[PDB]
Amino acid sequence: AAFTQAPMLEQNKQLPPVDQRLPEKPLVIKPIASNGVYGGTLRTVMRGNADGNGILRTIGPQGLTHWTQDIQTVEPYVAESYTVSPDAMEYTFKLRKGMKWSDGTPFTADDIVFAMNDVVLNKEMFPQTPSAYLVGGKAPKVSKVDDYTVKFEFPAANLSFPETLATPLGQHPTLYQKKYCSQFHPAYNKNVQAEFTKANVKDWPSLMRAKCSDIELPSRWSSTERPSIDPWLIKEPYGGAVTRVVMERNPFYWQVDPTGKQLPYVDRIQYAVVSDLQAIILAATNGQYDIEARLLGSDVTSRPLMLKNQQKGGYKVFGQTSANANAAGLWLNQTTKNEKLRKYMTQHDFRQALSLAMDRDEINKVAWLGQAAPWQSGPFKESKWYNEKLATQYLKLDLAQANQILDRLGLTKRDSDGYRTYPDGGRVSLDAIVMIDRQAMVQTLELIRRQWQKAGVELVIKGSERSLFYNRATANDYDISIDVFPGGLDATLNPRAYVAVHPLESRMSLEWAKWYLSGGKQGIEPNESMKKRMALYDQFVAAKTQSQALSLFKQILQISADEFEVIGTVRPAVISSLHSLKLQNVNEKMPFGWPYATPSLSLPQQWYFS
């Protein structure tokens, strides 16, 4: 009885009063910076007519949980609260009594149970269940406990599930209104076949996708009648050839600010549909967008143009933090077929010397324009996974120490070109594979080649397109592979740099990874420290409590630090973004990435115009 609404809703005479449209207890959103005011149209942009995730990452997945701003944990979001059983298998969600869909009808456990059992877990709909809802490849039992309580029962520990529910790919539970969607489902509509010709499809899964959609389908944004719990609703749909998309506030949105205003603050979102980046950067520098945090930061050429024109365009450039720990890390192949090299590749002090012979300040200045600070492979300080050794050991150039180590390891005989040689002959030479489309990585290797020559080590660059790059890796035909190190902020989601579990990307040895993934039937058996990390990883995946998962995974990171298997160059540059100076409550320190649906991580329903 203390809630208010956007003035524009006063004119809609088929709406109940705002306190009746809200849940009994709406979710209260604390603003990023200040309490807001109603009004305005958020101007943003999509590139082409297959950029529908741009809508999703603008308005935000409305999942059962939501990431915190530092993406260190999640909180109840659509769910009022939830419990986790001691064995980490059972997840029980309480829902917000009185919450309604965009069409004013009830949002209840019926919708979640329909979404899971009749859509997600239906083998005609999804012959392969989306991995978001699996553990060890197995699905949960999903049950209605009462109108506002739903239970997920997995057959194995699954502590990641609340985090999964905060990602775009884990939002199916709240995406399907049973009332609307059941019309297109044969378990509920005996005459669903009559719907096929209407929708212009030939089977009921295609019909469901057409009318009710999926996370990333164009049909999610192509109709006005598909109910949702989104902060804004499609009004001018994202059509195959439309030039703009318009969305308008959901009168039944289920959140208020601390003063009782039903969110969102902003009345409408208008998406310009634009043909290419050249046109998008121009409009952005002209100040035609109130927010752009998806497309411009992918193109390293955009930042100078954006900064130059801030005052002209009335906008502020800000920098988001990529999840990757390293922009261009050296993956050293412990199972290189070069037998003479392998006897050195497997020695910690050899890898240490190579890191000490690198000048990361030069790499940063020359190949990354000074925007990418030296770093190894470890999580960042703002991550709960931070390990100082894993992040910072062996970062500083010490050519004398590198040469002293290499002398000590017996690589003292120089050939006629000045390079070190193995004790029984042969130049100390490492083949590094690189994708030429990663131009900054190629230049980084060129700088490393010049630096390592000062330590008597030859780096031979082998640039190719993607397919040959991956062919060589999977064939175990490389000494070094250069590519990102994940783990700056997403170490458990993407642990490939710390334990050899990714079949294509854990390039300290994909033969080790093949062994792990095949249960020892294929590949090459890893060394003891890696087998131990693999055992710790399996235990971490099966952990029953947060504190147990934390201690197990920290052990993996410590062993990875002690081994020093992969050599980082520089952490990624910030991702350049902009918001108009009038747009308030944008979290300018938020990370970047698809699992967090950025920029919607920042809660666009509490952005507002001053």
Residue numbers in the entry: 1 to 610
Question: From the publication, what sentences describe this entry?
Answer:
SPH1118 has been identified as a pectin-binding protein involved in both pectin chemotaxis and assimilation. SPH1118 shows high homology with the solute-binding protein (SBP) associated with the bacterial ABC transporter.
These conformations were probably present in equilibrium in solution. However, no substrates were bound to SPH1118 in these structures. Compared to the C terminal domain of SPH1118 (full open form), those of SPH1118 (open form) and SPH1118 (closed form) were closed by 18.9° and 34.2°, respectively, suggesting that the domain of SPH1118 was flexibly opened and closed even in the substrate-free state. SPH1118 (full open form) opened the domains more than SPH1118 (open form), thereby increasing the surface area exposed to the solvent and possibly accommodating the polysaccharide more efficiently.
